[PDB]
Enzyme design. Sequence first.
Site, PDB file in Angstrom:
ATOM      1  N   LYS D  90       0.850  -1.176   0.000  1.00  0.00           N
ATOM      2  CA  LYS D  90       0.000   0.000   0.000  1.00  0.00           C
ATOM      3  C   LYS D  90       0.883   1.221   0.000  1.00  0.00           C
ATOM      4  CE  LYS D  90      -3.812   2.432   2.323  1.00  0.00           C
ATOM      5  NZ  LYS D  90      -3.604   3.313   3.545  1.00  0.00           N
ATOM      6  N   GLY D 151      -8.525  10.172   9.767  1.00  0.00           N
ATOM      7  CA  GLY D 151      -9.062   9.894  11.095  1.00  0.00           C
ATOM      8  C   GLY D 151     -10.549  10.119  11.389  1.00  0.00           C
ATOM      9  N   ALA D 177      -9.482   5.387   3.543  1.00  0.00           N
ATOM     10  CA  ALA D 177      -9.584   6.669   4.243  1.00  0.00           C
ATOM     11  C   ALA D 177     -11.011   7.144   4.575  1.00  0.00           C
ATOM     12  CB  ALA D 177      -8.827   7.733   3.494  1.00  0.00           C
ATOM     13  N   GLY D 178     -11.303   7.214   5.870  1.00  0.00           N
ATOM     14  CA  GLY D 178     -12.432   7.964   6.403  1.00  0.00           C
ATOM     15  C   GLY D 178     -13.862   7.453   6.369  1.00  0.00           C
ATOM     16  N   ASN D 199      -9.935   1.288   8.701  1.00  0.00           N
ATOM     17  CA  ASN D 199      -9.520   1.018  10.075  1.00  0.00           C
ATOM     18  C   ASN D 199     -10.392   1.698  11.137  1.00  0.00           C
ATOM     19  OD1 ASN D 199      -7.079  -0.174  11.850  1.00  0.00           O
ATOM     20  ND2 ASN D 199      -7.587   1.864  12.626  1.00  0.00           N
ATOM     21  N   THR D 200     -10.431   3.034  11.119  1.00  0.00           N
ATOM     22  CA  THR D 200     -10.847   3.803  12.295  1.00  0.00           C
ATOM     23  C   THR D 200     -12.244   3.469  12.778  1.00  0.00           C
ATOM     24  OG1 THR D 200      -9.427   5.563  11.467  1.00  0.00           O
ATOM     25  CG2 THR D 200     -10.629   6.027  13.410  1.00  0.00           C
TER      26      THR D 200
END
EC number: 2.8.1.10
Lengths: 237, 242, 242, 237, 65, 65, 64, 64
Positions: D90, D151, D177-178, D199-200
């Site tokens: 990645k 994040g 992302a996001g 992830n988050t």
Amino acid sequence: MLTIGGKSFQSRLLLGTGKYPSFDIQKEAVAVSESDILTFAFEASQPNFLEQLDLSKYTLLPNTAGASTAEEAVRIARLAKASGLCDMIKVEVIGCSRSLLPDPVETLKASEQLLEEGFIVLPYTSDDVVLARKLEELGVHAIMPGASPIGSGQGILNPLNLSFIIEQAKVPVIVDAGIGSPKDAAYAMELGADGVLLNTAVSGADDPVKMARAMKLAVEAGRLSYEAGRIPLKQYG
Amino acid sequence: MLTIGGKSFQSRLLLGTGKYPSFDIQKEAVAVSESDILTFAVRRMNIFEASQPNFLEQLDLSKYTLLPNTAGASTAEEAVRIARLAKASGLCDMIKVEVIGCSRSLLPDPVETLKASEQLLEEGFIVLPYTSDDVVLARKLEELGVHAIMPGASPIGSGQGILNPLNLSFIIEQAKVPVIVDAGIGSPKDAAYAMELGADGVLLNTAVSGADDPVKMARAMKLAVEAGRLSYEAGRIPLKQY
Amino acid sequence: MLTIGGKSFQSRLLLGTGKYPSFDIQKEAVAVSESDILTFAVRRMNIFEASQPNFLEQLDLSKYTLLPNTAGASTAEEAVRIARLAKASGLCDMIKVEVIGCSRSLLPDPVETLKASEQLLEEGFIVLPYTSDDVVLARKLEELGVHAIMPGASPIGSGQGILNPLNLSFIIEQAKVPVIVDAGIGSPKDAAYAMELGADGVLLNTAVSGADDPVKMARAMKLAVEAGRLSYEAGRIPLKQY
Amino acid sequence: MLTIGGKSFQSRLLLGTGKYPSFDIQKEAVAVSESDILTFAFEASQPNFLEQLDLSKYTLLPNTAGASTAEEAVRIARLAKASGLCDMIKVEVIGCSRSLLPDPVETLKASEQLLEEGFIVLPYTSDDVVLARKLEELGVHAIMPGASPIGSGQGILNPLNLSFIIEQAKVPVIVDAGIGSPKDAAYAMELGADGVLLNTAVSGADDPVKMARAMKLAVEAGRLSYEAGRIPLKQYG
Amino acid sequence: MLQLNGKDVKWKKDTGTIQDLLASYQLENKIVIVERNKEIIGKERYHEVELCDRDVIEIVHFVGG
Amino acid sequence: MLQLNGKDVKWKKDTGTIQDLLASYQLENKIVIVERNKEIIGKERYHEVELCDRDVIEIVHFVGG
Amino acid sequence: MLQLNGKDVKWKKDTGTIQDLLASYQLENKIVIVERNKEIIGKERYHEVELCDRDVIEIVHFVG
Amino acid sequence: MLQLNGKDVKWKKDTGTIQDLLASYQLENKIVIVERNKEIIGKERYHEVELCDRDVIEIVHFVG
């Protein structure tokens, strides 16, 4: 005031000249706009609008409109200064047949080599928060991110991204590409824009004359909000 | 030309008078707005306290039309007793019918607003209901013979702009008296937008009240309204899809 | 565990039965949905025409709870005469109160839905009003002693998703009987979202009906609902501002 | 199925491993996910999750997370293959302290020189419709545009732009992302995404275990809509 | 002579019951609800409520919503 | 003895008029609306409607909305 | 005999400048830009720059 | 006597390999990656690559 490359303009509205229904209307819409700054791009006799026009009171913004290569673009730029009427460029690398969106590599590359031969450069870019910075990080005296794609008036399809652009940059920021109505024009300024460049909304209006005036108000209104105050979005539990 | 109850108003912007930082700014913000039509509320006069300035008592009445409202009434009866009072003032003929139904949202009670509207009409008021934007309900208020329909954009003083264009547009499109968008408006952005869906006008308070530079903003809304209305008559480029 | 009128349902998804391309797909989409609770309408039986299949007559009634509705009634009285009929069927106890008020939007008439709701309650129905999402109005219906509140996300068969989270959230947050979001839902996107604002459940028809592969979609909504409900109980990361 | 660099995976969900509340939970969330593909990035004894893990059933996705230079990045990449457990990268060039958004020049530059030494590359990019193309136009076997900043779970802040990405590309597209909830996960797939990396939302959930399952459903649901049909947005006059 | 779902139909014979009627129109094995002069009729009373012939029936059923 | 905006005030003298009352409280030069036993009182009738003393006034005015 | 705008073409009386060239085409007064041998040629140099007859000139106008 | 992770440090008994180096630090069994003279050094070459004592090794772990 809005100040680009060390000269200032009292109107934070920049208006384009493409695709009006008639010269009689383009001529009128342009005055009613109160713009200063207008972008330009064997047969048989017809009027050309620029040579029916006083060249003191405006500040010409040529573009590289028709290039695919930063090569092809570099010419339309040097082809500009050959006329010796202009001293300011818009960097525009259309790369997508379908959207007409800026090409990050050529738009950047081309921006570098125009900046050597003492050009005033303001490129058309995306809303890649960084791609703004990068362009500006090599001496660019105004960064020009696009709110939507070009022909279709979808407004600021992403604040945040452009709201970032504003916070991080040290030169002026002007939204171009894809504004549809004052509603959109004015939204730009509220997040801290220094100006709005726009063609299609006015030219294609079916009352470009009126719509010219409306945009002219919008940018002001927008700029005044930001100018001071603004009610917070009220939250509830 | 915004025309409510047979009287016309050259300014499509209606401005409220509640909750400004000082009178010296409210007076000045009102001028700068170029408003005609300003809304006031009715409270008990503070008799046993002390000599305290009053904004309408300042107001040059020759320049403004008054639009008293019902704010404070929790039921229709209350709402009427306020319209009766405002009218005995000899200075106003219109009435903004406002029955806040939710103490947290401050969104109107539909059955009460409907009720006080039809009473006030029987009593010969020019009645402009503050409503929610329930589409069928707007129509219902209209069928009472109300003189303007006045849907919120988002909740009052809750500066969220037009949260549901689609409904406002049903409302605009079916209307047969003018739709003044009131309540919600946060930026000129919003004021403009309302106009651009063909709202007949905009009433707004908090966004100027609380804009911490209220005059600068009042100008700003003055223009956003003009801007919207103009790019409404102009006709405008569609949204290209792909 | 979605629980309406004292009876519980393990599937938070309620599925409608109108307007599928063929019975062989409606039967199969209904299975795949894993629904309990399916809504039907009441029309006059087509007596003088010819032997035409009927979906409930197919339906294995042991696997489904029925939720007849009022669709067709333009006034409350009409709406009741349908609830009376549906109940005489001996097969259903719940009633979805539906008084479409606008022939173009198909948005409910608030005063009629309020009216037929309080009648049906007097007549001992488990009454779930289809409402607009006027916040105060939801509360009002609730104060009738209605058994679920059922606000639209956007207009029926008008696949626009949740057009006004803010209101739905006022509605969710004040509610004291379950809020099933019905009407609007276009994608699993939407179904999911409703669940994630803490809707108690989702009723949906057109998005499966008209999805031109209805079974594949029914599965899809089955999961979106589960997905939402789960990432609702889980608690989730806020939105960082800047 | 989703197929990247000639190997396929039945789960179009890719899940990250950063910042969980406990190993006991990370371990569980990862199973419940049904993921295949997980990204990874003197003191005193503690467990390391990767060496408490069977390495057949997963497909490791290292990232260059901590680099500013495509230089600094190239190392974390070759540092990867030194372990000899991975065979897929990645590309991630954080450039903005404030947003953590990809750097168009280094992310592109770095993508070129990793691709020489037979790497499997999938970069983190923006939503510059073109910047997708450009990266892919030099042999990239999956393009990874970011729906929001990292994040903060703001979802697809711009379809259109990413809806374009989908139409124009020939390799797979994975939104990372996001993402904030299934609602967001599932929206991606509906415009034609081949997968979602996230992830988050899971790690930070306060029931990452549950939220893991929910995302696992979401991606499927989303993919099934697109799989066939979808009611048009109904217009009115 | 009846008013069946609004059409005016001739009813074969002298006497009859809600059941006889559903039979002749083939609705005996079909879920339907029957009302007779604005009165809703429970299925467990068909065989029993008499067609005071010249009068008002609506036959009705569930259909997709 | 009056009920003035809900407080029970002692009213100076034997007789009086809505005008006398506004005077004593300094409201003669102020826009206010007056109701007396639920009856709204037009300004052009103050001097004229008599304070049947021991009874109910609400004095009221416009304030910002 | 010069390259001219996509076509191949004749040039009467041999000796000449750019100024002359626009005389035969009816845009001596109009708006134009012109490029001889992929080298751009401007308004102010109009008398001074002579046609080396056989070569490449690209003339352009400002159009919407 | 070797460069080691930000610090300057001693190495007992002179002759040695990388395998040895991780023996004195308690992560012979753990997870690690190690770089001698800005040249990366891997697991499989552990016995075979000898410390030319004075030089630069950067050891790393997998952390969230």
